[model samples]
Target chain A: QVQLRESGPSLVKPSQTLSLTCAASGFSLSDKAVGWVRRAPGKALEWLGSIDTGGSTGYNPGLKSRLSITKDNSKSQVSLSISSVTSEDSATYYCATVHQKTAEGDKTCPDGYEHTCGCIGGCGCKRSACIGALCCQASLGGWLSDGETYTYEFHVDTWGQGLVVTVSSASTKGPSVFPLAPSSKSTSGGTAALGCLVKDYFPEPVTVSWNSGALTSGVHTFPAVLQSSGLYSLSSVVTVPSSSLGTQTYICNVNHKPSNTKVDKKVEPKSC
Target chain B: VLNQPSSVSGSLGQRVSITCSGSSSNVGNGYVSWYQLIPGSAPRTLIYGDTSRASGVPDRFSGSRSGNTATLTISSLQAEDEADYFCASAEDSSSNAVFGSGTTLTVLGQPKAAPSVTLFPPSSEELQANKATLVCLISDFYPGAVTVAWKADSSPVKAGVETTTPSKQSNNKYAASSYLSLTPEQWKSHRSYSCQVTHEGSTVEKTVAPTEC
Candidate 1:
């Protein structure tokens, strides 16, 4: 399997931005959602957010106040830029793929591809010389069909320059996949609450469940509030007594009717 | 060097050359690797396969790769530098090694995917009595084998602590744990103890201290 390795500065002075790269290829950017992880120099990971290939994003509310993640899909790279960084952002920053587990008994994404289509839009590309004798050149390409457009960013890696392209097609237009909700946190012996939020789902009502792998529990809900944008959104929250903290991993799985698309998040007790 | 025409080619243990067409690159060791120019202090492989560790090496070595080139740089290139420094590739039918004419590396094994380390800790820091435990976990490893060590104040702690390597998680992610028992003095005196986790080709370190609360 192709793997991604994050490389960048380990220590950043306060107020300076944290720049990191997730280098990956072989797999299409449209096939996986790249995720960012932040840790406290030495601590459990915090899921900052995810940047789909199309440039759309989502982040943890707690950390979102200080974070922003973006990627260049064509180059198979994800770059994270956070301004006014503090000592708290000093942990090893990483980028990974939120890949589709499987399709059996599950609804597939629009492209039926593993990840979102294309990559972030609007990332510029730069180019440089290749080999001493060989002229190394790089450029980005995009596909446009229908009203939907696809954009990709590429980097030469060697010269740190490349191209950007956008594609559009009449038949290819589609919305970015649902962004999974952030996991909720609770102190040991304190109540832990989590939710499975779905947005812009179509044709079918979504189902939400709170399950701890073996022992599933929680409220199933479908809200009547319609989003201002006309797209449908649903949310379900599951609360577990704090007594069982650290002892179990609670997951909230959302099921979309007719489509079978599911999105969920996990909540479990963790040490500071 | 232009008259010589930089012939940038690498084979096992042989010196190859890349005549810079333009200005010199601070990236000399970008995809760095070196081999025995002589013997005794044999030019031990410093970095290989692009940031991947050689079979066994000290922490002072490192590697990086970009475009068509690879680098292996040795900080404090000890007496071993005197030997024939070459970079090799495991890029062929055989696990055959190729040496770079100069200071680049290509390994002898089939170029597998780039390696990575995932740390799984119950918590970033562990707080216990004089004896404390820190767990460093990992994944992307198969046929499972790894080593976990604890370091205090920049040195390995020979606390004779037992280490365990277990099956991969349901996510099929490989993981292992390391326990360190430090005297209250060592635990409090040192800001934090580091758990260095290593797998076939990657290494990750996590350090933690007791929560202030």
Candidate 2:
């Protein structure tokens, strides 16, 4: 039952140090290894590096300069620090155990006779070190056909729940409202179908209403989606009267949050 | 520090060797051992004491050592030998084992098999939210080296296209997956999404469209 919990700030300002800690139990910090991994908004997972129990460490060459992975054996904890962060550093952070064998030549267990191989941490195996159990078997380094005999687990094995660390650097975006026009032709309704494309925005939660009211029946807004520029964007449509298209003006009002301020942007027939 | 090539390949009945270069502190006076990493399993000792074979190990796999270098030579390759290999030796003072970077031994000993590619369209829920993730499954390929490409309506796509590293399966073959993440609006507007896997100098392609979802 090895347990690991990551604690960090969810929102951090730019050019500030980002520090996090991984608290662990059910295992000795000086025996097991720990590593860091992260996944930014829509990008792939990135491997930071690893720190073995023996004071040896390795890191991803890309983040080697900005990343430093250290441990505190006495506290049963491992810590991570990245200096001078930015919006690109906003991601979900995680820590996992590195099960690769670091030592095997010290002990002469039963003269190492039984070569049976069955790991305890993978395939839902319980966590244990190379101590008194059926676990002190060989490891895989891929160099020995009959010599090395150590297990090969160059990848991470067990992982913590995860910590969402959003490097906050002006992620809030103002509204970029497009012109209002015909909503859709797929729908055969003969009513006026006025559509407004509310382009880029942030936070994913926004309100779109017609001049009539917030509970207008013909007002439709699409779900907000992440855009290529790392921001959010979506479309909103409103239907007015069939003859009211050119006779009178129909407005689409947008309500959004930027930073801590509540801002509203509206589009009218004259603005379109 | 010890170093070995990232990978090497050889044809059936041909001889291939992985070289391990080191300094005097490790390989100069110490004996070098070789290991064979079987996927889905731990590494097993193949050579010890610089040239001795482990019990039940095939003699075709030989180990050689010189002044400051060691080598693991495999002759008459077999399908079972298509695995990653490594070299290690005991270091002075600390008594710690220093291992050379592992090398992948791809044995071109099996029939020229093309990957059976399968393309999966986005799910119903994914499309309704304007998100689409198309998956391409590539499996059962020999020689372990394959390349994948994505095409949206015959147009090459690079952004949001990601492929996983090939995994050696239990059958001694290889398998991998590629993903294409795009908006559902763009997905439905295109003709088809293609997964083209080029392996053994040939291409095996699979295509799926929004209608297939």
Candidate 3:
């Protein structure tokens, strides 16, 4: 298992160097690549720099002048140092694997099936299952490659955030939560469909899960989709079999990890 | 839409094939790829562009497609082949990336086994804090699930105990470690400390006595 966590000072003064470390475990630092990414409050994500196991480094041209990426193979840790900090640099820094996009402009999807149709195309396929099948051919998507040999790029699965740092001064407002009551609809075939919607969370990552009742086979968890307003919205749904209908209860838990807040809702059969 | 089997179980040395189904809108339009995701770690690409193996991937692993359905075949399965496999397909410069849910392979060959346990005494840094820290390192186990518990002179000790998530090794086995911290007085006065591990319906416990500080 590959795991990484970020640590850095919570406050820094302007013109001071900003330093952060990504402590990793389960995999050899000498065998993988690590990268630093930051998101200013209410802003888009920025790729700072990347360091490979051999200590080779690459930086985004915009930040290359002040960013230095280094690694300690013995300690399995990657370090990032930036000289001269300013308010624009104050952000939630994340230490993640340096995943590279393919020459085709994106990583190839798992298994053969190269074309993808975005959910925006109104195709009925689940977002996770959107592929180059006939249902998506007439729509606005194409294949991942043009009959060229594809290479495997180094990448990792999980993501984590470090302390929220502020430069020069501080702002008091933290991430806010928008919670919606979970609702259930009774389907015709002795099954109930349950949905949970979590929206408008600032800063980026959030987690949502379902519990309490036995869910039928078709449980779909959608990826966190970004809204135009600079916040995020996530939705998850599960179909409960008739066997779990009588007196069982169901719970939907949404966690805003950065803000340390949880919004949960429970539903019963009558709630449908 | 793409569909993947939830699981595929087979014996060692046997041949197995897993399939992913898709529609003409997607699979019929482009190229396909496959990946192996060991739970808890980043995924590794197995086959790209349907049949080409990734760097260092064994030749026994192969991929093919018929119509809108793609298949990954293992010629001679080994215990190490047990992991979650996923299939993905997308267009040239287009809409979105589509993926099959994921299929888990279970290669049944070796029987589940217990881990070897060893306890190490505290270092100087721990001793300076008026606390005695002990480490329980458990290694070389099969099936990857185990529970660790600590006891001081036959009674359970809960406080200041930290356990790490099990890690997979190159040989397809697992290893994990746990830590116990106690006050110097408690460490010196206690006659015995034991680390108990439970795995595969059996238990193995290793005990230790404090040494002179």
Candidate 4:
């Protein structure tokens, strides 16, 4: 079986630079490419970038300009360099390989035929997950090192405006939808009002709808104004009768973008 | 200083990113994306700003973001995906500047799951009754869950009974178990039962003969 070992500075200051290496044995460097993953002290795995054994490489665009990877197959080793460090970048770094597809359509990374990878600034091959803007993700055609030992370096990449997702969500100060249902007593009347808030999205084009079984109706739209947070918020009210509640459940739904739709992932209406 | 939209229609493979600060080193954007290409496997993006994983991909990938910092996450190592991961713009920016040097990921053999094979202690071993119980254990597999079957003297034995467990190790890993009871009287006088474990991405197996207790 082959093995990968990494070495580098144990700690790095913010806005400084972090560097490390992945030394390998049991296979040809030219036969594989090397990649690096980053993790804050005790966090999930973080993709840094990669370099081929002969040298071709790629990096995270966020730090692409500040990252670098090089390798020496003859020496059975690969190197990683990230600059303008920050405390956030403090994590393990590693180098690895994915089976090189031959003329064959798609090939699997066989047993014993393993690649060597490295993580910066840690003892073993442990990793956390990405956070904030991006959710968790998986790289296709690759496997995470399971129960294997590898070396890594830790550092930081310091630069610009924090990554802001334009997609509507918590990032934007939209109206915080309160889960409220009309009082059953109020429903006794010919009509009851069900309200939902929508703030944070500017010039809101929001529409709330109520659905009961196969029947549905769009509630009245409101002109929303911005809150102190600089994002818009609005409320939608739907009128329904008690007669409608005995047989079905009322549902509130809000639409964002084509890709991000928020259904009323909750329910309520409680009072003293 | 990596340039954005290095070439073409600014597709996924091409490097690109949205400059958070509209171009400033001291206060620039923090999120980004990168991809990996292996010799035999398909090209996969390894990192995205804030350390996010793409969909249906392997757990080996990752991403992260901090204040003004972001990362893509990858763990458990693999050989093929160990190729190149180039960072591109989260939003297509300018190609005038160069990005960081590409990070080459390499996985050495201590294969993540280590091509491990465990023989379940004979569920029930009979002492010299001409029959013995043999079991095989395989943990964590990739590409897709594999096939585990038994054979005696090169002939397929009744598939007996088999079970599988997802790698407690983490996501994308699976575990498998298989067992067989052989009667030396009907089969080879002193033959070995081959325990074979096969998976799309990798393969492992071992053999044990009927022992005289």
Per-candidate TM-score, first chain only? 0.36, 0.47, 0.48, 0.36
Candidate 3 residues lying further than 4 Å off, grouped into runs, are: A1-272, B39-42, B91-96
Q: Report the C-alpha lDDT of model 4 over A1-272, residue by residue, as the tens digit.
A: 45566666544545666777777776777765556655343233355666644466756676788988888766777787778766566554545553221121112222222332432221221123322211111332223444432211111221111111111223322333443344433343676555454434532335566553233442543434334444544445555664554344656676653224465623344231
DockQ of 2: 0.03
Predicted candidate 1 versus true structure: per-residue lDDT over A17-111, tens digit per residue: 76677787657667666766443422333445666656777665555666777677677788776767754655545455542111122111112
Comparing to the true complex, what docking class would candidate 1 get? incorrect
Docking class of 2: incorrect
Reference-based lDDT, residue A191, model 2: 70
Candidate 3 local lDDT, residue B33: 67
For A65-91, candidate 2 gives per-residue lDDT tens digits of 998888889988898999999989887
Query: Model 4: per-residue lDDT, tens digit, B1-213?
Result: 333222211222222222211232211333355555342223354444335554456654555443233344455443333344545332222121223334444333422443445442221213244443454545445432567767776887764433333222233344444545445454346465677777765557676543411
lDDT of 2 by residue, B101-150 (tens): 77877777577656866555655544666667665666678767888889
lDDT of 3 at A131: 40
User: What stretches of model 1 exceed 4 Å from their correct place?
Assistant: A99-272, B1-213
TM-score of chain B of each: 0.37, 0.74, 0.83, 0.38
* A111-179 per-residue lDDT for model 3 (tens digits): 433434443443233223444344333352333233454333333234554446667543222233221
lDDT of 3 by residue, B3-37 (tens): 88889988889989999888755554445667776
TM-score of each candidate?
Answer: 0.24, 0.43, 0.46, 0.24
In candidate 2, position A153 carries an lDDT of 25
Residue A155 CA displacement from its true place in model 4, Å: 24
State which docking tier applies to candidate 4.
Answer: incorrect
